Amino acid sequence: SDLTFCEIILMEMESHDAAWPFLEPVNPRLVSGYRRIIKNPMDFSTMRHRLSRGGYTSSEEFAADALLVFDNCQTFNEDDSEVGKAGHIMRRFFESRWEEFY
Ligand SMILES: CCc1c(-c2csc(N3CCN(CC4CCN(CC)CC4)CC3)n2)[nH]c(C)c1C(C)=O
Protein backbone atom coordinates (compact mmCIF):
# COMPACT_ATOMS: atom_id res chain seq x y z
CA SER A 1 0.00 0.00 0.00
CA ASP A 2 2.76 2.41 0.95
CA LEU A 3 4.53 1.27 -2.21
CA THR A 4 1.50 1.70 -4.44
CA PHE A 5 1.38 5.48 -3.91
CA CYS A 6 5.10 5.91 -4.69
CA GLU A 7 4.50 4.11 -7.98
CA ILE A 8 1.88 6.77 -8.79
CA ILE A 9 3.98 9.73 -7.63
CA LEU A 10 7.03 8.49 -9.51
CA MET A 11 5.06 7.82 -12.68
CA GLU A 12 3.63 11.33 -12.45
CA MET A 13 7.02 12.92 -11.80
CA GLU A 14 8.51 10.91 -14.68
CA SER A 15 5.98 12.30 -17.19
CA HIS A 16 5.82 15.84 -15.79
CA ASP A 17 6.91 18.57 -18.23
CA ALA A 18 9.44 19.94 -15.72
CA ALA A 19 11.10 16.52 -15.15
CA TRP A 20 13.61 16.76 -17.99
CA PRO A 21 16.62 17.65 -15.73
CA PHE A 22 16.04 14.68 -13.44
CA LEU A 23 15.26 11.68 -15.66
CA GLU A 24 18.85 10.38 -15.73
CA PRO A 25 21.87 10.91 -13.43
CA VAL A 26 23.92 14.03 -13.97
CA ASN A 27 26.96 13.25 -16.10
CA PRO A 28 29.82 14.71 -14.02
CA ARG A 29 32.14 14.76 -17.04
CA LEU A 30 29.81 17.39 -18.55
CA VAL A 31 29.16 19.48 -15.41
CA SER A 32 32.26 21.21 -14.05
CA GLY A 33 32.24 20.92 -10.26
CA TYR A 34 29.37 18.47 -9.78
CA ARG A 35 31.27 15.62 -8.09
CA ARG A 36 33.05 18.03 -5.75
CA ILE A 37 29.80 19.64 -4.53
CA ILE A 38 27.10 16.92 -4.67
CA LYS A 39 28.15 14.02 -2.46
CA ASN A 40 24.93 11.95 -2.81
CA PRO A 41 23.60 12.26 -6.37
CA MET A 42 20.03 11.09 -7.05
CA ASP A 43 17.64 11.05 -9.99
CA PHE A 44 14.32 9.57 -11.10
CA SER A 45 15.69 6.58 -13.04
CA THR A 46 17.73 5.54 -9.97
CA MET A 47 14.55 5.69 -7.88
CA ARG A 48 12.74 3.76 -10.61
CA HIS A 49 15.40 1.05 -10.58
CA ARG A 50 15.35 0.85 -6.79
CA LEU A 51 11.55 0.65 -6.77
CA SER A 52 11.68 -2.14 -9.38
CA ARG A 53 14.08 -4.13 -7.18
CA GLY A 54 11.88 -3.49 -4.16
CA GLY A 55 14.76 -1.73 -2.39
CA TYR A 56 12.30 0.67 -0.75
CA THR A 57 11.19 -0.86 2.53
CA SER A 58 9.02 2.08 3.57
CA SER A 59 7.28 5.05 2.05
CA GLU A 60 9.58 7.43 3.94
CA GLU A 61 12.69 6.01 2.25
CA PHE A 62 11.18 6.80 -1.13
CA ALA A 63 10.49 10.35 0.04
CA ALA A 64 14.06 10.78 1.27
CA ASP A 65 15.42 10.06 -2.21
CA ALA A 66 12.84 12.36 -3.78
CA LEU A 67 13.83 15.22 -1.48
CA LEU A 68 17.49 14.45 -2.17
CA VAL A 69 16.92 15.11 -5.89
CA PHE A 70 15.66 18.63 -5.12
CA ASP A 71 18.16 19.35 -2.31
CA ASN A 72 20.99 18.53 -4.75
CA CYS A 73 19.25 20.70 -7.35
CA GLN A 74 19.05 23.71 -5.03
CA THR A 75 22.63 23.14 -3.83
CA PHE A 76 24.18 23.25 -7.27
CA ASN A 77 21.90 25.44 -9.44
CA GLU A 78 20.86 29.06 -8.99
CA ASP A 79 17.15 29.52 -8.26
CA ASP A 80 16.81 31.54 -11.48
CA SER A 81 18.70 29.03 -13.64
CA GLU A 82 16.75 26.93 -16.10
CA VAL A 83 17.45 23.77 -14.08
CA GLY A 84 16.79 25.48 -10.77
CA LYS A 85 13.44 26.79 -12.04
CA ALA A 86 12.43 23.27 -13.07
CA GLY A 87 13.56 21.83 -9.75
CA HIS A 88 11.28 24.17 -7.83
CA ILE A 89 8.27 23.20 -9.98
CA MET A 90 9.12 19.52 -9.47
CA ARG A 91 9.79 20.01 -5.76
CA ARG A 92 6.44 21.75 -5.22
CA PHE A 93 4.74 19.08 -7.33
CA PHE A 94 6.22 16.33 -5.17
CA GLU A 95 5.38 17.98 -1.86
CA SER A 96 1.79 18.74 -2.85
CA ARG A 97 1.28 15.26 -4.30
CA TRP A 98 2.90 13.66 -1.27
CA GLU A 99 0.58 15.51 1.11
CA GLU A 100 -2.62 14.32 -0.58
CA PHE A 101 -1.44 10.74 -0.01
CA TYR A 102 -0.03 11.09 3.57
C1 LIG B 1 22.83 22.06 -15.44
C2 LIG B 1 23.10 20.56 -15.64
C3 LIG B 1 22.01 19.67 -14.99
C4 LIG B 1 21.04 18.99 -15.74
C5 LIG B 1 20.79 18.95 -17.25
C6 LIG B 1 21.04 19.96 -18.23
S7 LIG B 1 20.52 19.42 -19.66
C8 LIG B 1 19.95 17.93 -19.19
N9 LIG B 1 19.32 16.89 -19.99
C10 LIG B 1 19.10 15.55 -19.46
C11 LIG B 1 18.72 14.44 -20.46
N12 LIG B 1 18.08 14.89 -21.61
C13 LIG B 1 17.86 13.88 -22.42
C14 LIG B 1 17.25 14.34 -23.87
C15 LIG B 1 17.31 13.24 -24.84
C16 LIG B 1 15.96 12.56 -25.13
N17 LIG B 1 14.93 13.50 -25.55
C18 LIG B 1 14.86 13.60 -26.74
C19 LIG B 1 13.41 13.34 -27.23
C20 LIG B 1 15.01 14.81 -24.94
C21 LIG B 1 15.90 14.88 -23.68
C22 LIG B 1 18.82 15.88 -22.21
C23 LIG B 1 18.80 17.13 -21.34
N24 LIG B 1 20.12 17.77 -17.83
N25 LIG B 1 20.23 18.32 -14.88
C26 LIG B 1 20.61 18.52 -13.61
C27 LIG B 1 19.89 17.87 -12.40
C28 LIG B 1 21.75 19.37 -13.64
C29 LIG B 1 22.51 19.83 -12.36
C30 LIG B 1 23.96 20.36 -12.43
O31 LIG B 1 21.97 19.75 -11.30
Using the atom order of ligand 1, give the atom closest to the CA of residue 73: 31
Q: For 66-69, which contacts have Cβ atoms below 8 Å and span 24 or more sequence positions?
A: 66/9, 66/13, 66/94, 66/98, 67/94, 68/40, 68/42, 69/22, 69/42, 69/43, 69/44
Please check whether residue 97 is in contact with residue 16, taking contact to mean a CB–CB distance below 8 angstroms: no
Euclidean distance between the first and final Cα of the chain, in Å?
12
- Technique behind this structure? X-ray
**Around Cβ 12, how many Cβ atoms within 10 Å?**
13
Model resolution, angstroms: 2.3
Expressed as residue numbers, the domain containing 29 is 1-100
| Ligand 1: residue whose CA is nearest its atom 9 | 21
Tell me how many domains the chain contains. 1
- Measured CA to CA, the distance from residue 9 to residue 46 in angstroms comes to 15
Residue 62, domain CATH: 1.20.920.10
CA 79 to chain centre: 16
- Measured CA to CA, the distance from residue 85 to residue 73 in angstroms comes to 10
- Measured CA to CA, the distance from residue 46 to residue 89 in angstroms comes to 20
Buried b (16+ CB within 10 A) or exposed e, 89-100: ebbebbeebbee
Q: Which residues contact 45 (CB under 8 A, 6 or more apart)?
A: 23, 24, 25
Q: Report residues whose beta carbon is within 6 angstroms of any ligand 1 atom.
A: 20-24, 26, 31, 34, 73, 76-77, 83
